[PDB]
C-alpha cells in the first residue's frame, strides 16, 4: 500500500494550468522559495511533473536511490510507451509484477495501474493472473509479492 | 536443566500480547539507537 | 573457526547485466559485503553522458519545433538514452553536431561522425521530422560521477541551450539477495548473489571490480596519523 | 518455481487423477529397473547439486514427470495385457 | 537505524522498555519424531 | 516442574525491619513480584519474522 | 575529492573516537557500517570457559558459609575479563584461594605471570564465618558467542563448563555529520566510536576489523561458471 499511495501535499493551489500559469519555468520557481511544495494540485499539473522527467524507470528509481524523491511522489515518467504522470513506486509495483511473471506487458494489462493496491485489488490480481497464466507463474508472482511486501513494510518503517 | 530461550518459546506481556520466538538475530542486525545500543525485541505493530 | 575460503561464480551476459555469487560465507557477511558494494556500485563508477542541448529556432524546456513530429522533451529524453564513450583518455567534454535533412528518421548515428568518440548505440530513435525538416543540434557530453540532475549544475554553453539530467553512472540498476546454504551440520551459512545492470559503456564484472577496488581503496585511509 | 511445468502436464490427461496414476506407475517401473528405462537419457536427465555437484536426481517421481512431457511415453486405459507386460519388461538389464 | 545497512528506516519508530514473561510451554517439552519403534502388544499400533 | 528456590537478601549483622524481606522467593526480586524481565523493544515489522 | 584526514581520540584501554574528515557524499555509512558489523562480531578476545569449585559437584549447588550459590557465582565469573600479554598463550587457570569472614572481589584471584584482571571489584562471592572457597577457573581465547551446552570443558570430574562471551568489543556507534571543507556543502564526516573491556583496544580492534573486511573483500577474485543462455 505505502509503496503505491501517491503523496498529496496541501501548501499551494494558486498554481497549475492548462495555459501556463505565469511561466512553466516560473511555476517551477514557485516550489523553490518554499511557497508551493511539490506534488500539489493546481490545474492541469503539479510541480512534481515538471521538476522530474525520467526517460526510463531506471532513471526514476536511481533518482529515488539518492535523496531526490520519495516513491510516493508524482512524476512525469516514460514507462514502456508513453509519458506517464505516475509515481516511482507505482512504477516499481508495475515492474515487480511484470518482472516476476515473465511479461512486463501482460502485467501492465492485469494490473490496476493508477490506484493503490490493497486486500482486494491484489486478490483480483492473483486470481486474474491464475487465469491467463497457470499456477506455475501465479506461484512465482505470489512469492514475489510476498518478498517486497515484507521488505517494503520494514524499510518504510 | 538450565534452559535459555529458543526458537519456539512463548513470550507474553501483561496486556495479553502472546507470541512465539521465530528468530534470534545476531547483534549485527537488530535496529539500534544512534548512541550504539541495539533493541532486544522487535514486536510487530499489526497485532495492536 | 573451522571451514574454508569461498567460491565466486559469475554467470554473465556480455555488456549489460551480470550475476555474481560469493557462495559459502560466515553468518552475516552477505550484507557486510553486498551492501557497501551496492552503494559504491550505483554511486562512484565514473561515466559519461549528455549534459546540455542547443537546438536552432526557439528555446525553452517545453516547446514544439515545426516540421518535427516529436517535441523538445521527447528529444531531450531520447538524448538521455544515448550511450557514448571517450577514446582520448584526457578528454573532459565534447560537443556533438547533428545535420538533419528533409523528410527522414533521425537516428543517433545521424550525428557528426567525429572520432575520439564512438557512439555505442547508433540505432536510437532521437527524433523524426516531416517535410521541410530543419533541426540543428549542439549537445555537450560530460565526464561525471553519479546522477547529477539539471537543477543543480546549470551547464552554460550558449543562451538557447537547455541543460539536461546527467546520468553518468554506467550502472543503471543494482540488486542483491542473501539466502543461506547448508554446510554439513550447519544449515545457516550465507550465500550472496549480486545482480548488476549497466548500459553499453562498462561491463558489470568491470563495474563490480571497480567497486571492490574503491571500497578497498577507502578502507586504507584508516591508518594511524 | 514449483514443479517442472505442472500446468502443461494436466493438459495431457482427461482427469487430474490420471496424471497422478500414470506418474506413479511410470516411477514404479522406473524404480525397479535401476533407471535403465529412461526415454530422455542423453543430457535431458534430471540432476542434483552438492558439495561435489551434478549427480543424478534420485527421485523416480521427478523422472516420470519430465519423461512424460516429451510425448515419447504412451499411456492407455486398456491396450496391452498385464500378465505379458510384466515379463517382457526384463530386456535391457533388469532388477 | 538498520544494523544490516547503516541507513535508517524512514519514519521514526516507537521504542522503549517492556515487561515480558517467558511462559509455561516450551519447544523443549513439545515436539517428537518417530519412524519405527515399540508397537503395543495390546492394540498393535505405535505407542510406548 | 517449576523449580522454586529461596535466595538470601540480608547482610551478616544488621538491624532488622520488624518483618522485612529476609530472603527472596522464586519469582521474587527484593520482595516485589518478578514474573519475567524488562527489556528494550521496537514496535515495527521486521522481514516477516 | 582530495585526501581524507584520520583523527583518533583514543582515551583509555577502552573507548576511542575515530574520524575521517572529508569523505565523498554518501560514503559515510558506506564505510562506517560493514566496519561496525565486523567489529560487533569478529574481533577475538577471552572468556571463562570452565570452573571448578571446592566441595561443589554441580551447577545447582550451594557452598556452606557462602551467601551466593554456585549459579550466582558462575553468573558473576561470566563478567570477569582477562588480558593475555603472551600471544603464545591460549588458556590458563586463575586460582581463588579465599577464606573466612570477608568479601571476595575478583582481584582476590591469584596473580599470574602474564595475566591482567581488568575488572577488580566485581563481586565473585560474599563469604561469612567459616566459609572456605578454593576455585579453579579456566580462561580460553576464542571468537564470538560459544555457550556451555556446545563446547563443554572437561578439565576434570565435577568441573562445570560455563557459557562464553568472547567479544572484547562492547558497543559500536558511528555518526555521519556535515563537515566544512572548501568543496560542496555535501560531504560526510564519519566518526566511528567503539568501546571495550581493557583487553583489546578501540584502535587495536578497529584495525583488526578493517583487516577482516579487506580479506573478505579480497574474495571477489576468481570468476567461475559464466556463459549464460544468450
PDB file of C-alpha atoms in Angstrom, chain D residues 10-77:
ATOM      1  CA  UNK D  10      -2.632 -31.705 -16.546  1.00  0.00           C
ATOM      2  CA  UNK D  11      -3.410 -30.857 -20.159  1.00  0.00           C
ATOM      3  CA  UNK D  12      -2.309 -34.253 -21.416  1.00  0.00           C
ATOM      4  CA  UNK D  13      -4.891 -36.145 -19.348  1.00  0.00           C
ATOM      5  CA  UNK D  14      -8.718 -36.256 -19.260  1.00  0.00           C
ATOM      6  CA  UNK D  15      -8.890 -36.332 -15.461  1.00  0.00           C
ATOM      7  CA  UNK D  16      -6.446 -34.869 -12.924  1.00  0.00           C
ATOM      8  CA  UNK D  17      -6.074 -38.254 -11.221  1.00  0.00           C
ATOM      9  CA  UNK D  18      -4.933 -39.958 -14.440  1.00  0.00           C
ATOM     10  CA  UNK D  19      -1.767 -37.830 -14.379  1.00  0.00           C
ATOM     11  CA  UNK D  20      -1.395 -38.960 -10.772  1.00  0.00           C
ATOM     12  CA  UNK D  21      -1.934 -42.684 -11.619  1.00  0.00           C
ATOM     13  CA  UNK D  22       0.476 -42.663 -14.569  1.00  0.00           C
ATOM     14  CA  UNK D  23       3.252 -40.639 -12.898  1.00  0.00           C
ATOM     15  CA  UNK D  24       3.035 -43.345 -10.224  1.00  0.00           C
ATOM     16  CA  UNK D  25       3.212 -46.427 -12.450  1.00  0.00           C
ATOM     17  CA  UNK D  26       5.996 -44.958 -14.585  1.00  0.00           C
ATOM     18  CA  UNK D  27       8.051 -44.171 -11.479  1.00  0.00           C
ATOM     19  CA  UNK D  28       7.141 -47.706 -10.347  1.00  0.00           C
ATOM     20  CA  UNK D  29       8.711 -49.334 -13.424  1.00  0.00           C
ATOM     21  CA  UNK D  30      11.479 -46.743 -13.402  1.00  0.00           C
ATOM     22  CA  UNK D  31      12.360 -47.668  -9.844  1.00  0.00           C
ATOM     23  CA  UNK D  32      12.640 -51.454 -10.361  1.00  0.00           C
ATOM     24  CA  UNK D  33      14.906 -51.426 -13.401  1.00  0.00           C
ATOM     25  CA  UNK D  34      17.722 -49.262 -11.969  1.00  0.00           C
ATOM     26  CA  UNK D  35      16.832 -46.247 -14.186  1.00  0.00           C
ATOM     27  CA  UNK D  36      17.985 -48.241 -17.265  1.00  0.00           C
ATOM     28  CA  UNK D  37      14.479 -47.499 -18.571  1.00  0.00           C
ATOM     29  CA  UNK D  38      14.644 -43.764 -19.383  1.00  0.00           C
ATOM     30  CA  UNK D  39      13.153 -42.226 -22.514  1.00  0.00           C
ATOM     31  CA  UNK D  40      15.014 -38.946 -22.002  1.00  0.00           C
ATOM     32  CA  UNK D  41      18.502 -40.277 -21.072  1.00  0.00           C
ATOM     33  CA  UNK D  42      21.053 -38.127 -23.020  1.00  0.00           C
ATOM     34  CA  UNK D  43      21.597 -34.702 -21.415  1.00  0.00           C
ATOM     35  CA  UNK D  44      17.929 -34.261 -20.514  1.00  0.00           C
ATOM     36  CA  UNK D  45      18.295 -36.435 -17.383  1.00  0.00           C
ATOM     37  CA  UNK D  46      17.423 -34.528 -14.153  1.00  0.00           C
ATOM     38  CA  UNK D  47      20.234 -33.663 -11.731  1.00  0.00           C
ATOM     39  CA  UNK D  48      21.265 -32.518  -8.202  1.00  0.00           C
ATOM     40  CA  UNK D  49      23.843 -30.089  -6.688  1.00  0.00           C
ATOM     41  CA  UNK D  50      26.108 -30.877  -3.695  1.00  0.00           C
ATOM     42  CA  UNK D  51      29.489 -30.399  -2.029  1.00  0.00           C
ATOM     43  CA  UNK D  52      30.526 -32.041  -5.313  1.00  0.00           C
ATOM     44  CA  UNK D  53      27.825 -31.337  -7.917  1.00  0.00           C
ATOM     45  CA  UNK D  54      25.749 -32.719 -10.824  1.00  0.00           C
ATOM     46  CA  UNK D  55      24.705 -36.164  -9.535  1.00  0.00           C
ATOM     47  CA  UNK D  56      21.591 -37.905 -10.931  1.00  0.00           C
ATOM     48  CA  UNK D  57      18.328 -36.857  -9.219  1.00  0.00           C
ATOM     49  CA  UNK D  58      17.290 -39.912  -7.151  1.00  0.00           C
ATOM     50  CA  UNK D  59      13.534 -39.161  -7.109  1.00  0.00           C
ATOM     51  CA  UNK D  60      11.775 -41.525  -9.538  1.00  0.00           C
ATOM     52  CA  UNK D  61       8.650 -39.384  -9.392  1.00  0.00           C
ATOM     53  CA  UNK D  62      10.544 -36.376 -10.736  1.00  0.00           C
ATOM     54  CA  UNK D  63      11.820 -38.523 -13.629  1.00  0.00           C
ATOM     55  CA  UNK D  64       8.380 -39.735 -14.675  1.00  0.00           C
ATOM     56  CA  UNK D  65       7.095 -36.128 -14.883  1.00  0.00           C
ATOM     57  CA  UNK D  66       9.919 -34.937 -17.205  1.00  0.00           C
ATOM     58  CA  UNK D  67       9.762 -38.194 -19.139  1.00  0.00           C
ATOM     59  CA  UNK D  68       6.019 -37.768 -19.574  1.00  0.00           C
ATOM     60  CA  UNK D  69       6.107 -34.289 -21.165  1.00  0.00           C
ATOM     61  CA  UNK D  70       8.399 -35.344 -24.019  1.00  0.00           C
ATOM     62  CA  UNK D  71       5.374 -37.079 -25.511  1.00  0.00           C
ATOM     63  CA  UNK D  72       7.553 -40.157 -26.119  1.00  0.00           C
ATOM     64  CA  UNK D  73       5.628 -42.130 -23.469  1.00  0.00           C
ATOM     65  CA  UNK D  74       2.280 -43.750 -24.185  1.00  0.00           C
ATOM     66  CA  UNK D  75      -0.366 -44.362 -21.531  1.00  0.00           C
ATOM     67  CA  UNK D  76      -3.683 -46.108 -22.081  1.00  0.00           C
ATOM     68  CA  UNK D  77      -6.873 -47.319 -20.423  1.00  0.00           C
TER      69      UNK D  77
END
